[PDB]
């Protein structure tokens, strides 16, 4: 009961901090979406059918071919963002559809009602991912890290989910990275490897090296570096309490 109360309270706090509504989070995180054939979905179908060349090879080549056309269709700005969103949806598979077998349900114009319902669910999950990226603000160097190596997000995750706690932790991750400021790309590429230590995060956040390494030793007794985001978040929570 008190876990549910604390969850609802901190979710409402994060919601009103992000200036969203419950309808907005319900749009970005729902699962009871429609099955009707939207004109945007029709434009995605005809673009991804006509503009695409001969049938290519999987996530290796077909994704790199179809990412500019998908970023053209659903209003994303970068083909790299569209590519890592395609990897995100290929490791999630809404209603069994990967990115392959959505192309095969497309480009037919003779499909079952279950087939067009599955393609509509696929396009709506794509639109939800577009909103979940452009609302929180992700220039893909933070995003494709969490897509490709979800261990660096949390060491227990191994598959980046479409859930509200994953959204909230994405928000706090993006907030810490934007609070890093001028060293943000260095913090990101040091978390890409396992070389992100104190005297770098303490420099990027204007803290003290010994205070940061004391909090890091408090959350992990022998882990010298920052090997994860969850240790960074609980380290900054320890710093907030100590401050």
């Amino acid at each position: 009961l008190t876990q549910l109360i604390s969850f609802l309270f901190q979710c409402t706090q994060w919601l009103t901090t992000q200036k969203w509504s419950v309808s907005d989070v319900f749009l970005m995180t729902t699962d009871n979406y429609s099955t009707v054939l939207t004109p945007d979905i029709e434009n995605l179908i005809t673009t991804l059918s006509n503009g695409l060349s001969t049938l290519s090879l999987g996530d290796d080549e077909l994704i790199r071919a179809a990412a500019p056309l998908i970023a053209a269709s659903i209003q994303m700005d970068s083909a790299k963002t569209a590519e890592t969103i395609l990897l995100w949806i290929n490791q999630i598979k809404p209603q069994g559809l990967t990115f392959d077998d959505f192309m095969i349900i497309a480009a037919n114009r003779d499909r079952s009602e279950n087939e067009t319902s599955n393609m509509v669910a696929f396009c709506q999950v794509l639109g939800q991912l577009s909103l979940i990226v452009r609302n929180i603000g992700l220039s893909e160097n933070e995003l494709t890290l969490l897509v490709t190596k979800p261990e660096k997000f949390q060491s227990e995750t191994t598959a980046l989910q479409h859930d509200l706690p994953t959204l909230q932790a994405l928000t706090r991750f993006h907030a810490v990275i934007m609070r890093c400021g001028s060293y943000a790309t260095e913090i990101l590429t040091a978390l890409e490897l396992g070389a992100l230590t104190a005297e770098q995060l303490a420099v990027a956040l204007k803290f003290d090296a010994q205070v940061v390494t004391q909090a890091l030793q408090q959350t992990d007794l022998g882990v010298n570096t920052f090997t994860n985001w969850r240790t960074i978040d609980v380290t900054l929570q320890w710093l907030d309490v100590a401050a």
Binding site: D208, Q210, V211, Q214
Partner: protein
């Protein structure tokens, strides 16, 4: 009382909390900030306090 009592200003190995809290309150400072204050006084080293 300004006694010649040794106290290692590394933030974990003091265990003489009277003089430590008195110095931290009198200098309005943390344990780590006191340690780096003493390190600045001896050129990045802590010989003996």
């Amino acid at each position: 009382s300004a006694d010649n009592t040794k106290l290692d200003l590394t933030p974990g190995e003091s265990k003489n909390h009277f003089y430590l809290g008195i110095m931290k309150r009198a200098f309005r400072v943390n344990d780590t900030e006191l340690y780096t204050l003493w390190k600045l006084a001896n050129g990045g080293t802590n010989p003996e306090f």
